[PDB]
Amino acid sequence: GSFVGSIDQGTTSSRFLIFNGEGNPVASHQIEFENLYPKSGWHEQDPYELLNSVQQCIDGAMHKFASLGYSKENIRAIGITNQRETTVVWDSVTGEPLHNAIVWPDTRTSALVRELKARQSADSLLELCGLPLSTYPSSVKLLWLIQNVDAVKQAYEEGRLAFGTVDSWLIYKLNGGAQAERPIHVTDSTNASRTMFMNLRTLQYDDKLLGFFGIDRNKIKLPKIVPSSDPEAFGKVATGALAGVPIAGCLGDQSSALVGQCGFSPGQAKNTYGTGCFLLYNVGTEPVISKYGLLATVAYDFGRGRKPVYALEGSIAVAGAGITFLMNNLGFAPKPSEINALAESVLDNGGVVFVTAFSGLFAPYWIDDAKGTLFGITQHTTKGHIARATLEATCYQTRAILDAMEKDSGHKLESLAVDGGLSASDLCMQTQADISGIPVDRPRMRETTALGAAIAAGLATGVWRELDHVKESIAGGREVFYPKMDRKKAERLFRKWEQAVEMSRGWVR
Template sequence: MAIERTSAQDTNPQPVPKEQVADGVEDPQLDEEKLKQFFIGSIDQGTTSTRFIIFDGLGEPVAQHQIEFTQKYPQSGWHEHDPKEIISSVEQCIERATSIFVDLEHNVSDIKAVGITNQRETTVVWDTNTGEPLYNAIAWPDTRTKGMVRELKLRDGADKLQDLCGLPLSTYPSSVKLLWLLDHVDAVKQAYEDGRLSFGTIDTWILYNLNGGKKNNVFVTDSTNASRTMFMNLHTVQYDDKLLGFFGLDRKKINLPKIVPSSSPDAFGAIQSGDLKGIRIAGCLGDQSSALVGQQGFTPGAAKNTYGTGCFLLYNVGEKPVISTHGLLATIAYDFGGNRKPVYALEGSIAVAGSGVKFLMKNMGFITHSHKISDLAASVQDNGGCVFVTAFSGLFAPYWIDDAKGTIFGITQFTERGHIARATLEATCFQTKAILDAMELDSGHKLNMLAVDGGMSNSNLCMQTQANIIGIPVDRPAMRETTALGAAIAAGFAVDVWKEFDELKGINQKDRVIFEPNISKDESEKMFKKWGRAVEMCRGWLDADEQNGEFS
């Protein structure tokens, strides 16, 4: 069947239904009637809200509920959450979504298992004896540790850490958040000295509480979350004494959760109260890993990009970790246990994606609602010569330019709001290409398609532009709850809702669409070269004494 093609300059580009893009490989046949009778719950505990979604065996949401919770900003650069409020939000979401599920005339007993996906790096500490938190959770974007990170980088062995754990020293990992707590919170320091300090990321805290807290003391983390702490050796998938020693931690004084695979029928325990009492928790993945699983990124070279406030791009590199030499992070993509080896990924982050759209809306008054950005960008035929380097806080991967500032090049009297809107969308697409190029250099795997999700992926214009800039197809699912779906897949796999990875390839394939690149390679390279010039020209806006803290 002929594929309808549209140009990037069209004001309303139309994606191509995936079934029209035949590759000679038939999708696996699923027993749809059987799978519609199986249900898996998924707790999606994010940075600003918690959700519980119940999926059927075809990966379709059946019932869900979402609750936003309090964001605490005690000082500039600080970002905290109340650990007890997080647990309350989880319990409320489970209760309300389950009520909807029952109202649809389903039985709770039809829910075979529950999975968890969570914001990564966010750090919780509690008293092992009482189960009570000793301080607010320090959220992953928190930057109070900038000064500490500068000092840590001067320690002997700092340049060797990334080879062991895949992560460079920065304010993001859980390690530096824990050190700050030990240095600044008396209750935490005393618990450590007494040997009653329990440390965990959000997954561990949720699992501990859903299993009844100190009574049953289910104290585990999965390997995707553990790989974000800087305490786990990426090669052995175990805590590493060299890493712990670098941070000055005594394993006899701190309780670290046991590292287990992301999919397991028994490692995560079971829910101990409420409507789902007795139902097993069988899957657990950090949110970006979970999105890769939800997008069925099971083969080396598969990649997904989540377009949220920023962008997180994960690239499957197979069963051996690849330590980046091109400005990326190495992490565990997923670990389905059994006789299978963990699968690794390279990760790149873009600081500004949806937040660039919000900037045009809130700061500049260009639009009244975020979703109207596409209409504004489509009001012009192209960017009118404008390039917008959205370096509001410098540039992240793979550039890591801390002295860059947001800069618009090419403004003339011809420039309209639509040109700047289009340039804003293009900025995310250009940075995505830069990360993909770095990933291919690091991994040796050639990318052949990019799976996408998140708010900006709703824009046909943005996704068509993305396909044109990276020169490969962009694959967008109709059901975009891929992060929650990934946790459900991990849980369902553990309890034999699905038994083989080939079966999973048929999940969430309904009504997917493909954006095919439809400009020449020369034209795409010309656009990217111009972007590269703009990136170089936006350097050096701040002298060293003008910078407000270290970029991390």
């Protein structure tokens, strides 16, 4: 068994990838699936559309895999990775879903999060699970279910209702659900840490957290928290083209990005660009709570005698959206490619700074009364300067989050891996290297998030045996940007950014 499969069940799409030993994808398949928004701010998904989109991705990829004369036999194991926090409720005895899945960006729980943060008990939660209380974690979402849908009310107190993030849903159904000879209702530590039901230092459940939400361990059926890489806690695929192939890896998606970039040491960090950014920062083997609003979480739990590695996480709202703003709202250019050309048509930012706080700023500034704000404008300011400033703003925010991650962890920043969206822009990554003063790593193999789950599964089954093995194996079969700007001029820019942030406070009244 030489190949490793990976399920990547995302927020808008599912894909299934088959990598070889060098970590290059050989067959693949991707499905954009249906996302339901009942009323504004509500975000739902049919749980069978997520399972079927994955299973159809397996079917199609295995079609192509077959075309190269390879079979089920060539795939030793598969890993799952999934959008996090999204919340699935099913009948623990029938396997049927008891209501739609509530996706992480859903805000229907906004009215409620007031009540629970209103309960004074609620602020040693942060050092218990790692997470500020949001509309985001699945705990708040599950609670809203057990108090607004009757089938969930009923099933719950009948000892009948099972819960899990998307990972555990997927693993349960792929093993055959309730009909399996060994029903698998498990979750990995990274997914588990996003619920607010698990204790970060334990990697198991904490009854104070279960208590605050009023979640009873004996009427709700909760997945056994297992490692992210285990040779048999995830069972095997029951049906389909991959019948009998064991599932040996499971990771929340952002952690799987970091694993797939081989950021196994403290100080190694990854950034994933889309409309905004997901920053993940490896902080080694003891949890680190954050002074700065960052989330503490599990990076990966590879078991096999080894300790779980934790991480800090921050997010940016306006990355790709700043580009989109220049295109749609100013008509600078039609496509991202040529906004990026605009930015390079000038030598520097001409003194322009663009605080892109369209919806305020988040980690680590936490300014809610700024709007987007553009400084440094003169008759000599051109489209190019603004375009460069807009790129630079995501670099400044990335650096601000990375700096905050240093002060929380005590580990020097060592490297920044990047993937997705804006990371395609040569100037923007070069500017990250200059501003942050470390090398910025951009792989050319496009599916690093799926690669992470493959890595966890390959380790549980011996495709790779050490993790020093893994980075060396994937490297076989531009890409790295180095700081060229002198540090003096690299620090006037960042201080010019911090002044600007300062000066954007208190705009709205």
